[PDB]
Amino acid sequence: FPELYFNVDNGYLEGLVRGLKAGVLSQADYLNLVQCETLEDLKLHLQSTDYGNFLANEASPLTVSVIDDRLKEKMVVEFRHMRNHAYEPLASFLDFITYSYMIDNVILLITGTLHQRSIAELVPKCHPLGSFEQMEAVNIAQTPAELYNAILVDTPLAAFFQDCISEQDLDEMNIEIIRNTLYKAYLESFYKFCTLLGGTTADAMCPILEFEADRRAFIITINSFGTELSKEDRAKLFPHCGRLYPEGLAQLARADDYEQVKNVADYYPEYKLLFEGAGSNPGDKTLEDRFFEHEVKLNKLAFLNQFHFGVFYAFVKLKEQECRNIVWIAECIAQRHRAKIDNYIPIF
Amino acid sequence: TEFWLISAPGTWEKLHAATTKNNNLAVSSKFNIPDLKVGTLDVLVGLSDELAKLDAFVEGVVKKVAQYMADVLKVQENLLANGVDLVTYITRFQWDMAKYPIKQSLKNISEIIAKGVTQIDNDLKSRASAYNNLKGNLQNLERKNAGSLLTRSLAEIVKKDDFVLDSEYLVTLLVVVPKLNHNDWIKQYETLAEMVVPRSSNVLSEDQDSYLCNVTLFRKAVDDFRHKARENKFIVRDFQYNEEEMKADKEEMNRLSTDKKKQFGPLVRWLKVNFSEAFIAWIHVKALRVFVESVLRYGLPVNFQAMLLQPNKKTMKKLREVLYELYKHLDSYYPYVYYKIDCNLL
Amino acid sequence: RLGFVAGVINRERIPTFERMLWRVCRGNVFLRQAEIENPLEDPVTGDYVHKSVFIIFFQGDQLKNRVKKICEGFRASLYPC
Amino acid sequence: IIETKMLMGEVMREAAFSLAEAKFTAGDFSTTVIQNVNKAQVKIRAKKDNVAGVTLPVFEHYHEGTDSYELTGLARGGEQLAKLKRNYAKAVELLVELA
Amino acid sequence: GKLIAVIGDEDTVTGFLLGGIGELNKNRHPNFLVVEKDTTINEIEDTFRQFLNRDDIGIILINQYIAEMVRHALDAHQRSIPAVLEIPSKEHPYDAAKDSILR
């Protein structure tokens, strides 16, 4: 019933984004990258993939800050191509992927405002996916975050700012409480939008958005032990989206200890066996290196369905792992510290 | 297993046998502790903040060593000087030579128990963690001997006729080719680079998915062939004379198997005497917590009447309610002296 | 030797203060209450409360550290006696 | 001096690799960290020590601890951070003894 | 002095600002300078004068890759305070400092 339609508007773009799956590096592509000894030789072993001739114009001294910036500018021009050819049931979905980067850029645009800076932080120091090159009133808003917050409501992040009054970001709230309260309102609005689009895109995507609400339920309550934010301050940072919602979030707001978040993940047998990072050992994978193996395990499962929108969000989050894996191979090669070079995630 | 220890002073020692008449609640053993040194009023209540911290700190040390009992080979054989925890709870008394009664009970008797427990906590954290490193390297013993031909060490596939000695003009490389591209590699092993031996292709050992072979080549043409081997999906692994040191690692797999066994009996003899000393140290600290808060809750003419209790199962709601009426008329949490101990180890 | 401290407290928690102060010091105190008349008022702490007199002797000189936290927990104001 | 120029050659190797572990987990925080500086945490006071009557200016570090990066990451990262903070506060404790 | 200053790099100063050495008093200056690839040598010389002639700057950290650009400038500094330390970077560890030339 969503299969006999959906090739009307989104049939060419789905076959395109599955053609970009075939360019995601396999295990045998990674095993030829870990044999490289210099970043000059990593330029050679990357040319046998579909990345080829992307570092051919930079410099003869090839540093790791150029490879990282040239890898992620290739994911932008692949995402901007699939957005400029998108139709309105899919273009509303592709704009919801960029709100995770518009949130990370709005917060970067108010730290310069509280410290009296300008557009000099905008162009070089923001992610190109969530980018402000339109809404040009943001680009000249030198006002101290009061006549500027009245311009951020002329931006697609306006519907998320209904829990942040312009007096709260005016030195009243910490800069990470403004992040995660927007990201709480972002995931809960993206979970409802992915439920209105029913059928195949609501059962291949809501398992991904349930785990994203349980990563930030576990990682927030673990990093909130030594710091000064109360239990009522992190209970409003939990997104009400995941599997943990009525019961786990009641216990996670009362934890105060790492052993009290381990026995609330024991109730859920998918989250236990993920809590066996166990960083008391010197060399092994930590907790977030085991949460990244589960983020990309659910993202590979979105390509097992066909007629759905979840094939596009599971490509951006697997081309982001390419910009994290190849840089990690390049950062263990340039430093010649390649005993932990196998601590990447072998996606395909 | 659980436990409850409650003293009920004011004959008065005969009403403790009346608690044994309620057969459905407890047996109400005596568990007498000897007379200690008194003479302080400010330091008696000031020791109550230190004795509560000492009873909790010594409880986690013995509960951490009971968790290490699964690593030596659930098991309940931790006798306390040829005596079970239930047999010692019916025959508990002061040692008077390890916890001396001539010394002060608040400061000096506790500090001898504190410094002894802190050294046994240090000797359990420093010595037992070193044996985990030889067992942590023992986890890497089979890790070097697991997987395919690439992930496995070559301590058992070695052969003197499989490599070319006098390597001044030759070199033998252990190449791995898949089972599907074996015929594609046999027509391309001599054409991967210049000056390649075209008849030295000999599959020494094969696996279920691939096959490991030997490929002789010159000393100068080893790098360009291996760079072309990555394009042709061939896995070339380096080889050296460290197999005699891997044969020494084959004996180190038996040396670590000997270092685990020689340290097994040494650590099990250490955990059998130190945990019994720390469990008796927490038992002496509970009686110090029972000698405290009984001269303040009750009067101190000379000394309060000493008494204890026994454990109970599933009738504690009726046992606390039957003691709630007899203790509400004594006073004006519980209305009397009460300390909840855990008889279980895990 | 020592053991005298004088303060004041409201009558709306005078029965709740003496019940909690006995369990915190494990006894060894003599707290004699004394009620008052028509209410006074303080600016920041206590507004329009018919208070009562309070003295906790306890003869301890280290139980004052067990009487310093209990006095501010129930909002009692002491004075040099 | 020379023994602690080869000791900071491996401490700064581990600390720069710990930054490489933290960018693998939590995005890029090289614009949040640089912008959010208001007050310092690790300062120095100049002590005096003398050999044969000639005083030598020596430095001793101290911590007036209020963390400006107490919340950094906190939903992504936060465990690779605060062990990057330990691997560079240990480098400052060494580099003040070199200074 | 009482502060620690760092010239460093783009990756070096963001590791040391997490150590807790950066202080911002906008009346005078910030106590660091992130050097990118597109800063001239004239900008490195100006902030190096600012850190020497400041009162509370006690220790100056700088990468040896950056210090060779102003090698004529720090040899002119022959005082006891502040200490100009030369630290390694990515693929530029250590060859020879100005302090070990003084031997």
From Swiss-Prot, chain A:
The UniProt entry's GO biological process terms, in alphabetical order, are: cellular response to increased oxygen levels; cilium assembly; intracellular iron ion homeostasis; pH reduction; proton transmembrane transport; vacuolar acidification; vacuolar transport
- Primary site of residence: membrane
Free-text tissue specificity from the UniProt record: Expressed in brain (at protein level).
Q: Topology relative to the membrane, per the entry?
A: Peripheral membrane protein
Q: Where in the cell is it found?
A: Membrane; Lysosome membrane; Cytoplasmic vesicle, Clathrin-coated vesicle membrane
Q: Give the species.
A: Bos taurus (Bovine)
What is the protein named? V-type proton ATPase subunit d 1
> Which of UniProt's keywords are assigned here?
Cilium biogenesis/degradation, Cytoplasmic vesicle, Hydrogen ion transport, Ion transport, Lysosome, Membrane, Phosphoprotein, Transport
Annotated positions of the Phosphoserine modification: S280
Curated annotation (Swiss-Prot), chain B:
What are the protein's GO molecular function terms? proton-transporting ATPase activity, rotational mechanism
A matching Pfam family: V-ATPase_C
PTM N-acetylthreonine: list the residues: T1
Query: How does it sit in the bilayer?
Result: Peripheral membrane protein
**Which GO BP terms sit in this record?**
pH reduction; proton transmembrane transport; synaptic vesicle lumen acidification
In terms of CDD domains, this protein maps to: V-ATPase_C
Main localization of the protein described in the UniProt heading: membrane
Q: In which tissues is it expressed?
A: Expressed in brain (at protein level).
- This protein's superkingdom? Eukaryota
Where is this protein localized, as stated in its record?
Cytoplasmic vesicle, Secretory vesicle, Synaptic vesicle membrane; Cytoplasmic vesicle, Clathrin-coated vesicle membrane
Share what the entry says about its subunit structure, partners included: V-ATPase is a heteromultimeric enzyme made up of two complexes: the ATP-hydrolytic V1 complex and the proton translocation V0 complex. The V1 complex consists of three catalytic AB heterodimers that form a heterohexamer, three peripheral stalks each consisting of EG heterodimers, one central rotor including subunits D and F, and the regulatory subunits C and H. The proton translocation complex V0 consists of the proton transport subunit a, a ring of proteolipid subunits c9c'', rotary subunit d, subunits e and f, and the accessory subunits ATP6AP1/Ac45 and ATP6AP2/PRR.
Report the function annotation for this chain.
Answer: Subunit of the V1 complex of vacuolar(H+)-ATPase (V-ATPase), a multisubunit enzyme composed of a peripheral complex (V1) that hydrolyzes ATP and a membrane integral complex (V0) that translocates protons. V-ATPase is responsible for acidifying and maintaining the pH of intracellular compartments and in some cell types, is targeted to the plasma membrane, where it is responsible for acidifying the extracellular environment. Subunit C is necessary for the assembly of the catalytic sector of the enzyme and is likely to have a specific function in its catalytic activity.
Report the protein name in the record. Answer: V-type proton ATPase subunit C 1
Organism the protein comes from: Bos taurus (Bovine)
Curated annotation (Swiss-Prot), chain E:
* A Pfam family this chain is assigned to: ATP-synt_F
Keyword terms of this UniProt record: Cytoplasmic vesicle, Hydrogen ion transport, Ion transport, Membrane, Synapse, Transport
Q: What does this protein's UniProt record list under function?
A: Subunit of the V1 complex of vacuolar(H+)-ATPase (V-ATPase), a multisubunit enzyme composed of a peripheral complex (V1) that hydrolyzes ATP and a membrane integral complex (V0) that translocates protons. V-ATPase is responsible for acidifying and maintaining the pH of intracellular compartments and in some cell types, is targeted to the plasma membrane, where it is responsible for acidifying the extracellular environment.
Keyword Transport present in the record's keywords: the answer is yes
State if Ion transport is listed as a keyword. yes
Q: Which GO terms describe its cellular component?
A: clathrin-coated vesicle membrane; membrane; synaptic vesicle membrane; vacuolar proton-transporting V-type ATPase, V1 domain
Q: Which GO terms describe its molecular function?
A: proton-transporting ATPase activity, rotational mechanism
- Predominant subcellular localization, coarse grouping: membrane
Native organism: Bos taurus
Write down the membrane topology.
Peripheral membrane protein
The processes (GO biological process) annotated in the record are: pH reduction; proton transmembrane transport
Its family?
A: Belongs to the V-ATPase F subunit family.
Describe tissue expression. Answer: Expressed in brain (at protein level).
What is the protein named?
V-type proton ATPase subunit F
**Could you tell me the superkingdom of the organism this chain comes from?**
Eukaryota
